[PDB]
Each structure stands twice: as C-alpha cells, then as structure tokens.
Amino acid sequence: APSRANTKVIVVGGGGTIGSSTALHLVRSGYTPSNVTVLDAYPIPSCQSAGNDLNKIMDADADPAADAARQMWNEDELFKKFFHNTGRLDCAHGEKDIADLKKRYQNLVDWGLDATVEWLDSEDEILKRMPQLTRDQIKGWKAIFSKDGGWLAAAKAIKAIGEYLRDQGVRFGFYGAGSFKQPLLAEGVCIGVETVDGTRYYADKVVLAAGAWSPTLVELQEQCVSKAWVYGHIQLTPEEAARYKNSPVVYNGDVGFFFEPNEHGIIKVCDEFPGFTRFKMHQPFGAKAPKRISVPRSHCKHPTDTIPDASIVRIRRAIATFMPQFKNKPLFNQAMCWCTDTADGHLLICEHPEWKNFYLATGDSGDSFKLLPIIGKYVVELLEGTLADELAHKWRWRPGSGDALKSRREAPAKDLADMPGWNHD
Ligand SMILES: *Cc1cc2c(cc1C)nc1c(=O)[nH]c(=O)nc-1n2C[C@H](O)[C@H](O)[C@H](O)COP(=O)(O)OP(=O)(O)OC[C@H]1O[C@@H](n2cnc3c(N)ncnc32)[C@H](O)[C@@H]1O
C-alpha cells in the first residue's frame, strides 16, 4: 500500500459540496495534489451542484460536526468571508405553530445555553428586529431571533475551494471527461473509474460524492431517494436593497423564507415543502435491469426549465406575506435544486460493500451545505480507517432501513410528472 504522499485518489462529484470538501481535506492532510483527481459533469463550482447557490442558511445546530463546521465558517481563512452572521428570525402564527415555537425556545434553554437567542412576543418586537416587515401581515406572529448563524455565500465558497485546488496542482476532468459511467474493478477491488467519453482514470481510492446523482450512478437499493427544492429571485433597486442590508434570514415554516439581497440587489425566496421526485426508468451500474428511480432533472442541462406552478404560487404567497410592497416584481431565475434523502436523514459515508476502495459520500438529506468546511475531514478519515465508530455506524451502508421517499419529512415527496409548469420543452 502506498504512503499517503504516493496515494492516488479520485473524487467523483468533486465540483460539488462534499466532493470539493473532500479534495480540500486530502490536500490539507498531506496527499500530493497532483495525485488527486476531481471529476465532475460540470467545472467547479458545478452548475448543477446543490451548493451552486447565492445563499444557504447557516443554523445553530448543537451536533458535533455542525459545531466543527461553524467554527471553520467563523475562523478558517478560506471560508470565513462567505459566512454572513446576520442572524435568523423564525416566525410562527396560529396556536399549533406558536406552541412548537415556544417548545423550541425551551429546547435551547435546556440543550444549548440560550442568551444566543431572544423570544419575540409581539408584532412590535419583531418589527424592531426586522422593520421592513409589514405590521398587518404579521398580526399575531411570534418569533425566535437567533444571533449566531445567518447565511452562507454557497457558490462563492465552492468556487474558492476550486481556485485553491487548481493552484495546488489538483487534476481535473469535466464534461465527457468528468461524467462518471462506471468503476473499474479487478478481482472485486475498485482501481479507478471510466467516464461517459471512455476516459479512464486509475487510483488507489475512489470517492463517489455525486449528490442527488449518486443513486443514478451506482445501485444504492433505495437508501437514497433524490428530490428537488425550488426558489426564485426578485430584483431590488439600490435604494430598496439598502433597506434590507444585513437583514436576518427570515423564515416561517408555514410560508417559506428569504435572504438579504446579494451585492447585486437580488433577493432569493424559497418555499417550504417536502421536495419533488422525478421518477423514470434508469439503470445504475450494478443494477441488472432498468429500475424506476428518482433521477434529477438538471436545470443546467435543461436551462429552459423553471419550477412547478404550485411552487410559484407558494413563493408568491411568501412575497405577499413578507414583502407585500414587492408583489409586482417578476420572479426570475426560477430553478430546481437537487438533494438526496436517506430514510433517517443521516449521511451515507461508507465503503462500498462489494467494491473495495470505492467509497460513498452522499445522503446529504437537504441540510449539508453548512458542513462544506468540515465534511471532507470525515471522508478522509473513512479512507484512512480512522473514522469514529459512532459516525461509521450512523453513516453506514443500510439498505432496507426505512422509506426514503418520506424520510423524516412530513410527507412522501410528490413527483414532477404530476406537477405542471416547470417543463418548457
Ligand atoms: C437544493 C437545496 C439545498 C439546500 C438548501 C436549499 C435548496 C433549494 N438550503 C440549505 C440550507 O439552507 N442549509 C444547508 O445546510 N443546506 C441546504 N441545502 C442542502 C445542500 O445544498 C446539500 O445538502 C449539499 O449541498 C449536498 O452536497 P453534495 O455534495 O451531496 O451534492 P452536490 O453539491 O449537488 O454535488 C454533487 C456533484 O456531483 C456531480 N455529478 C453528478 N453526476 C456526476 C457524474 N456522472 N460524474 C461526476 N460528477 C457528477 C454534480 O455535478 C455535482 O457537482
């Protein structure tokens, strides 16, 4: 077995979140960069990566991995400039949701010494934090304001990792040269990969970090089920955008959520719902015949696609609620953004059970962008046999462990076949 410095690694989906983090940690840990090969369907930051976004939410999760990531977002010189510590305002209306919000302000006294949070008990209190909100729209609302957290400039952070890797001498292959087709196997050991154009790459270890594409590329036995979420954007004038500078992330689980305008004056608005599948017949490597599997419908591959009409209605309601003064702005650059759910919502980070030296690093479950800085550390630990037992178990190979179509969400995802308005072919 080669020394670390002579060990060759291929990261499939290295243009995305987990895959770029993995490449970075291989470099940071003392792998020789020219021994590391990033393969992606699209150049880093991949156009179709779920991390290719103006913004994501950084919450205040107590989990050890999330806390390790939060520290890096605050202190790591590669990542720090992309974390915007604006705070988050979580709003609720009606006795059911206000009951759950109250409960939750008590999970935080209990679980993680509060004082990093405020209860807001009236319209007046919320308006003091977020004065751009409309009083009559928030009649009867309560909120929790969390001081830590905020948002992450997601595309820029992956792009910064790519620039770092390029400058270190990491090898890249994109498009036909980067699109995984199959592993190369010799006597049950993975010795590299082949891409759709027939290019072969040989390495000691292969990481499959293909996000929502992972269950399309190899047979995962429904451990992961791929689903899309949706957003649109509105353009503010400089004067309008100035009013929202450093605004918290604003969220109401019955409505949706929105972010501070970017440096171009654009606000992204998002729905809140259990995701959409797009089932069709497909044959991953290792499947003996085609199967009905949820296969991403990639906005990058089909840039005339939008989102479902149902999704537009929901986003419009979010704008009518949160920003009634902007109800006439067109919602543009509507897109679907793919992730893959496990049954329990934990990652799938494990060696393949039959293909030695092939490792899965997926199962993102819609909440892993905030792990970008840290997650490749764990992947490297997996490759090196040093991953903590609890995590090796939590992230294990586990077909038959529950229905990922519902996962731990409120309902089984609906399918795009049944949701008109996104396909303009
Ligand atoms: C879609 C979404 C996700 C999301 C979010 C809102 C939306 C609409 N809000 C979040 C938030 O507020 N906070 C948070 O922490 N996360 C949030 N997310 C989730 C997050 O985006 C995802 O969990 C995470 O980014 C997933 O990362 P992963 O690395 O698993 O997936 P990826 O970034 O999409 O990268 C996969 C890459 O694989 C490449 N690919 C695909 N096919 C191939 C082949 N054949 N060969 C090689 N590479 C391939 C893709 O191109 C992509 O780069």
Residue numbers in the entry: 2 to 426
Paper text:
Fructosyl peptide oxidases (FPOX) are deglycating enzymes that find application as key enzymatic components in diabetes monitoring devices. The inability of wild type FPOXs to act on intact proteins is the most critical issue limiting both their diabetes detection efficiency and their protein deglycation potential. This is due to their buried active site and narrow access tunnel, as determined in multiple crystal structures. In that account, using a rational design approach involving a five-amino acid deletion at the entrance of the active site and a number of further mutations, we described a stable PnFPOX mutant (named L3-35A) that, relative to the wild type enzyme, features a significantly wider and shorter access tunnel.
These various strategies involved mutations to either improve the RMSF of the protein (generating mutants hereafter referred to as D-series mutants), increase the number of salt bridges (C-series mutants) or form disulfide bonds (X-series mutants). Our MD-based ranking led to the selection of six candidate mutants (C16, D02, X01, X02A, X04, and X07) for experimental production and characterization. On the other hand, the introduction of extensive surface charges and salt bridges (mutant C16) resulted in a further increase in Tm of ≈ 1.5 °C (Tm = 55.2 °C). Finally, the incorporation of a single disulfide bond in different positions on the L3-35A scaffold led to a significant improvement in thermal stability of all the tested mutants of this series: X01 (54.1 °C), X02 (60.0 °C), X04 (55.2 °C) and X07 (55.3 °C). In particular, we have shown that the introduction of a disulfide bond allowed us to produce a PnFPOX variant that shows remarkably higher thermal stability compared to the other mutants. Based on our thermostability results, we selected the X02A variant for its high Tm, high expression yield, and detectable activity toward glycated amino acids and we set out to increase its activity toward larger substrates (i.e., fVH and F6P). The activity toward these substrates was present in the wild type enzyme PnFPOX but was lost in the L3-35A design.
